[PDB]
Amino acid sequence: SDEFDALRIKWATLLTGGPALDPADSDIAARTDKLAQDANDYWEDMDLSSSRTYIWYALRGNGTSDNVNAVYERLRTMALAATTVGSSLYGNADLKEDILDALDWLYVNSYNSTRSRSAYNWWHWQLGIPMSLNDIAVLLYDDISAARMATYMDTIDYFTPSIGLTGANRAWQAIVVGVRAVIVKDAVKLAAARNGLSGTGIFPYATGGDGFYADGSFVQHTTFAYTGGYGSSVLETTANLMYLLSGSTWSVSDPNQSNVWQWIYEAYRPLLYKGAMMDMVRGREISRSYAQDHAVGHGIVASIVRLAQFAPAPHAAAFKQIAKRVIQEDTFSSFYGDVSTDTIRLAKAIVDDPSIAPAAAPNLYKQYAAMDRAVLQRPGFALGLALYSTRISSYESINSENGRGWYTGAGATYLYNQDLAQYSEDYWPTVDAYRIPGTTVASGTPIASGTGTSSWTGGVSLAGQYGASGMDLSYGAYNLSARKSWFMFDDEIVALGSGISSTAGIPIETVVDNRKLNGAGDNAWTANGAALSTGLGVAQTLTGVNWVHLAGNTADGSDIGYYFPGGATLQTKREARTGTWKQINNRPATPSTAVTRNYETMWIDHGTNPSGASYGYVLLPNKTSAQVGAYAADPAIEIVVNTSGVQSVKEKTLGLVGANFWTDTTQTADLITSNKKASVMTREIADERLEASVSDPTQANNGTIAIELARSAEGYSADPGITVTQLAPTIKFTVNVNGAKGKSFHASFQLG
């Protein structure tokens, strides 16, 4: 028994679930039956004759990365069904030989060192295929002759001989070099893989470019928010590799590995909602039918469970609590339904352990300044806000993926509630891509993929409880500019727009919402107390509307109210939309099956060539018709200002005042006065204390922000970087935002 021999068995168990895997388990049973079934269909119509010019007719083409890569995945699936306890194909020797022969056929006809290491698509040749190959190698290790194993691992070492990329890609090389190292028992290479994790975009926090940021953000491809896309892969790969090496000669020792624990707390947890990984941070992956939010979420929890196996306390235990909660929260799609059998085994051990209680649900506001994202988590609902600027791009679309993601990150609001299916069930291929909720656009007109021209994108966080965000809008593809702000309070979100001007000669609109409805598309809804028609295919204009209520898809926990201060005119339509994933993902493997979903879409029409137009609306999650009606009668919020210079809102019951200042001039909103671009929020406790949070959203101010609060104080306490120069008769202080990178600075004053 070699050490490598031990590692190999360890990895094999990670793939099959080991010999302990209990096939009596209801969920484990399902996972294997499905694996065996899939393995059969593949084996069944597989071309076995030595004359064959392809393995599977439907995948022929020894020069198409996609096809070849897909052929290895299938072989991988077959190898698993032949080594997983409970599988009807377990041990079947014929199946094993067929897999091996197919592998030989590929080495000769398509996968060998005579090909360009950089031949499109490079990813497939250097990472995708090798990862599948190693897995087969490890699973059929005993049945693989030294001769064959040579042609297998030599080719791999050819394409990927070392580690030198960043983020997800560097991690992928690491798992490729490492797993191969264990197979060919090369201690050098293996030590090389372990060290690769300390590289760019992984263990060490990034200050720019790809990687994880100290504020929890995750970037990939230089300018895209990717926590849920490439980020998922980095987490999965890093967890799998760290677990393999853990407790061995090549165990990870880099001190930065502790940042991995923080990833889970600050980078992932806040973006998870009852099993779903928010689409706003999944990039172009939202266009993948096999990777909708809950499916992706399950993958992330699977990694957390993996980390829980070797993570040091208290982390290990905390990870268990978080996984247990999410597994119990997701009643939409079973967690055990789409993760590895080993994950199921390990997960069940946590859920059935009574000594382990579910973690508390997150309740907070967080500003992901490095990736122009913000998230609000409350009991009963979550709000995700996607923005873009000179630092982050509008959306990514490469390799024929995400062709209609134009506005998915242009001041887009994503509401999460009891309807856990809202963004799954083919939302993306059917939703009107020109009307993404919360955005302001030129009707039916797209924009390009790229960074913006304004740096004012971000917001402030008040003690991680409340917050405000803003985005200076100016599209490049066409003339349209506006100031958009969002104020997040306890149970309402206030959206404000001003300075909406255009010369594009195209109608401009602001999408209040665009929700997928139930199967019948008959959700009930009211306006100003009047029941509205619920028939599909009906468009209608609601004039002089103060409030609207829309019943959700669940009995409770998914209703949404809309309040319009000062009244508004809404353009609406309830229609059935048809689409195909092929339309937004034009790759071979995408199903071209048509699907139909129902929608209720509501927008404000600003007319053509508007000048200084504006809007204001409040989202009231989980309230009944009556409640929304009551609210509109005696609103808790109050619009302090909504000009192109400053947008401010007040929350009378909580004593909160938020303000976004758009220009570098002295301006005043309620009790707040600022001399520069800033996002400010204050909380006043009658004759007790006054709290304030300030941030420089532009991340370009090399000096200070001078703030003045119209209140008299007796004393203070503040974050370093703040200098109070006066407490009476009014409060005055400056904030050193030089190199702050969009962070919030807090100060607390004792009132007379």
Ligand X SMILES: OC[C@H]1O[C@@H](O)[C@@H](O)[C@@H](O)[C@@H]1O
Distances (CA, A) of 477 to 406, 442, 449, 453, 644: 11, 10, 10, 12, 22
State the CB neighbour count (10 A cutoff) for residue 604: 22
Instruction: Considering the candidates 111, 152, 213, 230, report the single residue annotated as catalytic.
Output: 230
Residue 365 DSSP SS3: strand
560-579 vs 731-736, strand pairing mode: unpaired
State the CB neighbour count (10 A cutoff) for residue 117: 12
Question: Residue of minimal CB distance from ligand X?
Answer: 123
Q: How would DSSP label each residue in 29-57?
A: HHHHHHHHHHHHHHHHT---STT-S-SSG
In angstroms, the CA 740 to CA 503 distance is 36
Token output for 242 = 């760290």
Q: Is 123 in the site for ligand X (CB under 6 A)?
A: yes
**230 noted as active-site residue:** yes
User: In the complex, what is the shortest distance from the CB of residue 102 to ligand X, in angstroms, rounded to a whole number?
Assistant: 22
User: In the complex, what is the shortest distance from the CB of residue 117 to ligand X, in angstroms, rounded to a whole number?
Assistant: 16
Which residue, chain included where needed, has tokens 């993929």?
449
Residue ranges in 574-603 that form contacts with ligand X under rule CB under 6 A: none
Number of C-alpha atoms within 13 angstroms, CB side, residue 404?
21
Token output for 362 = 């997150």
State the CB neighbour count (10 A cutoff) for residue 734: 17
Q: How would DSSP label each residue in 389-401?
A: -SSSBS----TTB
Q: Which is nearer to ligand X, 285 or 513 (CB)?
A: 285
User: In the complex, what is the shortest distance from the CB of residue 395 to ligand X, in angstroms, rounded to a whole number?
Assistant: 14
Return the axis-axis angle of helices 167-183 and 230-245, rounded to nearest 10°: 30
| Site track 327-356 with ligand X (rule: CB under 6 A), x = hit | ------------------------------
Residues in binding site for Ca(2+): 490-492, 651
In 580-685, the DSSP E strands lie at 595-608, 613-621, 637-642, 646-651, 656-661, 667-669, 672-674, 678-685
User: In the complex, what is the shortest distance from the CB of residue 284 to ligand X, in angstroms, rounded to a whole number?
Assistant: 7
Q: Which is nearer to ligand X, 178 or 229 (CB)?
A: 229
In 3D space, the residue among 149, 108, 107, 98 whose CA is nearest the CA of residue 129 turns out to be 107
User: In the complex, what is the shortest distance from the CB of residue 587 to ligand X, in angstroms, rounded to a whole number?
Assistant: 8
Q: Is 122 in the site for ligand X (CB under 6 A)?
A: no
Q: Are 393 and 224 in contact (CB under 8 A)?
A: yes
Q: Which is nearer to ligand X, 126 or 673 (CB)?
A: 126
Q: Which is nearer to ligand X, 287 or 558 (CB)?
A: 287
Residue ranges in 278-317 that form contacts with ligand X under rule CB under 6 A: none
Q: Which is nearer to ligand X, 123 or 716 (CB)?
A: 123
Token output for 77 = 């699936």
Residue ranges in 126-165 that form contacts with ligand X under rule CB under 6 A: 128
User: What residue type is 24 in one-letter code?
Assistant: A
381-386 vs 713-718, strand pairing mode: unpaired
Strand arrangement, sheet containing 672-674:
667-669, 672-674, 704-709, 731-736, 722-726
In 97-190, the DSSP E strands lie at none
Residues in binding site: 121-123, 221, 230, 284, 288-290, 399, 490-492, 587, 651
Q: Residues in contact with ligand X, total (CB under 6 A)?
A: 3
In 3D space, the residue among 119, 124, 111 whose CA is nearest the CA of residue 153 turns out to be 111
In angstroms, the CA 64 to CA 51 distance is 21
In angstroms, the CA 699 to CA 701 distance is 6
In angstroms, the CA 313 to CA 292 distance is 32
Give the list of residues 6+ apart from residue 146 with CB closer than 8 angstroms, or none.
none
User: In the complex, what is the shortest distance from the CB of residue 121 to ligand X, in angstroms, rounded to a whole number?
Assistant: 7
Q: Which is nearer to ligand X, 397 or 502 (CB)?
A: 397
In angstroms, the CA 197 to CA 166 distance is 10
Residue ranges in 206-235 that form contacts with ligand X under rule CB under 6 A: 233
Q: Which is nearer to ligand X, 56 or 123 (CB)?
A: 123
User: In the complex, what is the shortest distance from the CB of residue 277 to ligand X, in angstroms, rounded to a whole number?
Assistant: 14
Residues in binding site for xanthan: 121-123, 221, 230, 284, 288-290, 399, 587
Any idea which residues carry the catalytic annotation? Answer: 230
- Binding footprint of ligand X on the chain (CB under 6 A): 123, 128, 233
